[PDB]
Amino acid sequence: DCYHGDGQSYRGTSSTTTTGKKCQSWSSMTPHRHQKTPENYPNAGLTMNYCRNPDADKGPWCFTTDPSVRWEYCNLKKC
Numbered sequence: 001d002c003y004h005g006d007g008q009s010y011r012g013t014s015s016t017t018t019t020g021k022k023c024q025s026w027s028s029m030t031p032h033r034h035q036k037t038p039e040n041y042p043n044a045g046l047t048m049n050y051c052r053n054p055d056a057d058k059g060p061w062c063f064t065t066d067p068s069v070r071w072e073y074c075n076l077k078k079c
């Protein structure tokens with residue numbers, strides 16, 4: 001659907017970036033290793049590969065499943 005404000009409260013099912021790439025799961029370290037895991041960000045709703053905003057950036061984002069592109073913003077409109 002959409003997100004409000006900076007989308008740190010977004011708990012949707014969206015999981016595709018702005019360029020149509022599929023998001024990587026927050027609990028996997030492949031293809032990109034990272035520290036934005038549910039253990040490090042317990043209140044961010046980090047589940048499956050859904051778009052989220054653990055670091056309080058401008059809007060929901062995800063690590064991508066393309067080995068060449070670490071992360072991008074998600075394909076979501078601002079409510």
